[PDB]
Design a protein around this ligand. Sequence first.
Ligand SMILES: NC(=O)c1ccc[n+]([C@@H]2O[C@H](COP(=O)([O-])OP(=O)(O)OC[C@H]3O[C@@H](n4cnc5c(N)ncnc54)[C@H](O)[C@@H]3O)[C@@H](O)[C@H]2O)c1
Ligand SMILES: Nc1ncnc2c1ncn2[C@@H]1O[C@H](COP(=O)(O)OP(=O)(O)OP(=O)(O)O)[C@@H](O)[C@H]1O
Ligand SMILES: Nc1ncnc2c1ncn2[C@@H]1O[C@H](COP(=O)(O)OP(=O)(O)OP(=O)(O)O)[C@@H](O)[C@H]1O
Ligand SMILES: Nc1ncnc2c1ncn2[C@@H]1O[C@H](COP(=O)(O)OP(=O)(O)OP(=O)(O)O)[C@@H](O)[C@H]1O
Ligand SMILES: Nc1ncnc2c1ncn2[C@@H]1O[C@H](COP(=O)(O)OP(=O)(O)OP(=O)(O)O)[C@@H](O)[C@H]1O
Ligand SMILES: O=c1[nH]cnc2c1ncn2[C@@H]1O[C@H](COP(=O)(O)O)[C@@H](O)[C@H]1O
Ligand SMILES: O=c1[nH]cnc2c1ncn2[C@@H]1O[C@H](COP(=O)(O)O)[C@@H](O)[C@H]1O
Lengths: 157, 482, 79, 80
Amino acid sequence: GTAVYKVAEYARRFGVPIIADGGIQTVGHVVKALALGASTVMMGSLLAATTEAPGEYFFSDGVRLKKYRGMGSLDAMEKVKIAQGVSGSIQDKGSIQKFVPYLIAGIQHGCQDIGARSLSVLRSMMYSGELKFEKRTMSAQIEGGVHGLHSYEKRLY
Amino acid sequence: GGTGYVPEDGLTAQQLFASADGLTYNDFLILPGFIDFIADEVDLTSALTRKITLKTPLISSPMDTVTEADMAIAMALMGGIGFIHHNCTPEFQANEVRKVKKFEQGFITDPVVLSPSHTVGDVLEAKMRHGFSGIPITETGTLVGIVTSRDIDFLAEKDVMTPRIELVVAPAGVTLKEANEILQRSKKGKLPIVNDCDELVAIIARTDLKKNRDYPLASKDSQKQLLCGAAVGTREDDKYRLDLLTQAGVDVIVLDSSQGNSVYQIAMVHYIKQKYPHLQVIGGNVVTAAQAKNLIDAGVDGLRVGMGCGSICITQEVMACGRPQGTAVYKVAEYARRFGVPIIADGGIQTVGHVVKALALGASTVMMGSLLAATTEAPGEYFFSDGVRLKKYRGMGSLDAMEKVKIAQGVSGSIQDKGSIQKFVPYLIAGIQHGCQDIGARSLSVLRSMMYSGELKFEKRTMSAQIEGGVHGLHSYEKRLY
Amino acid sequence: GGTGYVPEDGLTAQQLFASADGLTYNDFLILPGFIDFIADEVDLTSALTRKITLKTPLISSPMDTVTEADMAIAMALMG
Amino acid sequence: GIGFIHHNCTPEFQANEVRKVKKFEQGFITDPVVLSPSHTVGDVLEAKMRHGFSGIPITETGTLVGIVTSRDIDFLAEKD
Ligand SMILES: NC(=O)c1ccc[n+]([C@@H]2O[C@H](COP(=O)([O-])OP(=O)(O)OC[C@H]3O[C@@H](n4cnc5c(N)ncnc54)[C@H](O)[C@@H]3O)[C@@H](O)[C@H]2O)c1
Ligand SMILES: Nc1ncnc2c1ncn2[C@@H]1O[C@H](COP(=O)(O)OP(=O)(O)OP(=O)(O)O)[C@@H](O)[C@H]1O
Ligand SMILES: Nc1ncnc2c1ncn2[C@@H]1O[C@H](COP(=O)(O)OP(=O)(O)OP(=O)(O)O)[C@@H](O)[C@H]1O
Ligand SMILES: Nc1ncnc2c1ncn2[C@@H]1O[C@H](COP(=O)(O)OP(=O)(O)OP(=O)(O)O)[C@@H](O)[C@H]1O
Ligand SMILES: Nc1ncnc2c1ncn2[C@@H]1O[C@H](COP(=O)(O)OP(=O)(O)OP(=O)(O)O)[C@@H](O)[C@H]1O
Ligand SMILES: O=c1[nH]cnc2c1ncn2[C@@H]1O[C@H](COP(=O)(O)O)[C@@H](O)[C@H]1O
Ligand SMILES: O=c1[nH]cnc2c1ncn2[C@@H]1O[C@H](COP(=O)(O)O)[C@@H](O)[C@H]1O
């Protein structure tokens, strides 16, 4: 968040747009990244393990999992070394053609909650002080999720 | 001189929120003051709206797994109120509001009645369907005698209709004491009620009076019926629903919505205030004072505060928008008390301490969804898993509730049984009273007066302070609240 | 005058990063504003570079388990 | 068929069991809990909490004056 805000603030002085690259896990992360000044949001793992993603699904513990690894992992440098990445597995998400519209609708509903009819208007509100923010202690984030239940199922789309 | 000297220890509510951290209920404590009274003198009288006033700051949330006729009735009996959900056809909700408005404290609601042009098998069907087998039959529907269980237990065929010997009835309408007397003096089970025309208007079943307790905290309107609320949306279809709901005599309308500061909510507020100037409208949800200002100008009578804090909510990790609930409650209540509007701390309540903190930060009423769900008055039927009785509890923005492009802002889950409202809400009331006594406030109005004047002091809690503030250092333990 | 009055609630993005904590996405929220339109009027048009312009702010990362011809095609189809 | 009462009990216990069988009478009651007018309204509450029924055919000492049943006590809070 800090990186995105600071680099976007410096780069908007020169009309350069930046790309919030990494750490995206929900649609809310996308809305926050776009609100802090990122013009585009690059997603690696939110898109991996879909039908359009390279590699073939495998199986483990009865869930369809593709492979997801970092370009700085060891298993990817093999194509003294210091791995700056990790190789792992992501459960199937479906297809891009049914997932990316979910993100688009989520981004739109978030931007409507905010009160911004456009992403350019969203960033205009952010830079002019009209868009307000709010920190969250760790308790506020625990409360901001799902709590107080015995068990539950979360369906996004 | 005058007033005295107390040392300054702790933060005021203004200093507590000056650091602009996202404080929530678990993040702070209230420092104790001076006890000069007992816990039972605490006056929990709360302002639900500008003109409505309850005797218990509890509300049940308009969710389809929380509030229907049963819980609304229970809550209004215990001193609070309920808000019937609108995840149903408008006539369903209006019928629920009516069912509440005609509860009448010991009589029967919607009594299954039959007619002489029936068989002796219809009463067997009623037994297998509803549960009772004593029916006050009469001409067509809703006075000839009653057919009860002790009239059919020696038959094996479906064609008993007790004659007019039951001179044990009430003339027009009697108190519960008169009914107690007539039952003691008449020794039978059904006590039908008649009028000058001598038609079935009401009926009393003996099992009711055998366990009819008292409810001193009334929550009743002028005509002495229970209060009831109703969630209506803000689309075009909801004006018809609002018509049906005011025809049933609903006392208060909450504009059910995630983000209540829209042109739609303001339009609907204006429509309601222009059409039924007697209706008390509650707008929400709002977490900032700008939203509160828009809605208070529009003319709401109360505000409903909370966005993302609910137990089944995922709005914040989906829409990225919300506020920590302690901060939201404090800020919106501080802005709304400038206009005499009372707010409703809506969401995130999990203990009695959360209720005391919400009321201390300025909330006049505290709305509870999951703290009340999975009780006996809550809609839906218990199921089983891992040997614990669990009802269903879901969010009105979940997928399983929109199914009655799509983005779920809620989650469906299960809550273990809590018991009944009539034994749980008194636990909360006693807890609120003992908390308010620890604080040193003899009423909720005095509590908020202490908070706004700097007399009530607060205290933050690092995460370590919250770990320590719970149960720790034990091998294993059992926590019984009540 | 001629701009209205809204109460000040919450931090601006400048004040949010003035404390110099290491804030990330999970550390803050956006406070809501005024809805005067529907969710489907939101124009997600984004500037990828100085001259390129997409209609959806999403990109797939250049990683060997994410983007090849198939996902690139799909992503460009979705905007 | 038939049963055979065990004798892992005192002889009087087993004889009482044999008697209880020999006087079953098909629809009547065996060992009816009966009270006497020189009792309180609390003895019937004790009978309810002990056996389960609350309808007792009271009479002079044991085993005829009328019966006291459940629908005669459900509006009282004192033991006379
Ligand atoms: N934190 C919260 O309080 C919270 C959060 C999410 C969901 N919910 C519950 O979810 C329920 C419904 O889900 P929701 O979040 O989408 O609320 P909602 O009923 O307001 O959803 C309606 C959607 O269409 C728009 N809308 C409302 N009225 C409209 C009108 N006349 N014309 C055009 N558009 C209109 C709104 O922007 C909204 O996106 C609500 O009853 C609410 O109780 C509550
Ligand atoms: N016609 C009726 N209509 C609606 N509710 C009734 C009716 N009769 C009894 N009840 C309600 O349902 C409950 C059951 O009544 P109750 O069991 O005491 O008498 P009953 O009808 O004779 O049943 P049973 O023969 O099993 O004893 C009552 O508490 C009362 O609230
Ligand atoms: N107000 C009443 N007046 C006169 N008779 C009544 C009245 N209520 C019920 N009865 C009659 O008294 C008899 C007994 O009915 P009652 O309601 O007292 O018990 P029940 O629920 O029918 O059966 P049980 O005694 O096993 O619970 C019935 O024949 C019934 O017709
Ligand atoms: N004095 C009694 N002594 C022994 N057994 C009795 C007695 N009264 C009832 N019972 C027996 O115990 C059972 C109790 O059923 P019953 O309906 O007759 O109780 P009751 O008189 O209606 O009191 P309650 O209202 O508590 O049910 C009967 O099946 C019967 O076999
Ligand atoms: N043979 C009987 N003759 C006259 N009165 C009786 C007789 N048996 C019971 N009663 C009386 O009639 C009334 C009805 O009581 P009854 O035995 O029918 O049911 P109960 O067990 O008392 O209550 P419930 O209906 O819940 O079972 C009682 O006041 C009782 O004193
Ligand atoms: O091997 C790696 N080590 C560390 N970071 C990587 C590596 N490969 C890719 N990345 C970055 O991680 C991002 C993945 O996004 P995310 O996993 O969805 O958070 C990519 O867009 C790259 O910027
Ligand atoms: O579907 C939903 N998604 C997010 N929040 C909801 C939803 N339905 C109800 N709520 C809110 O969550 C509250 C539930 O309170 P709680 O679960 O006891 O914290 C309700 O009073 C509503 O304000």
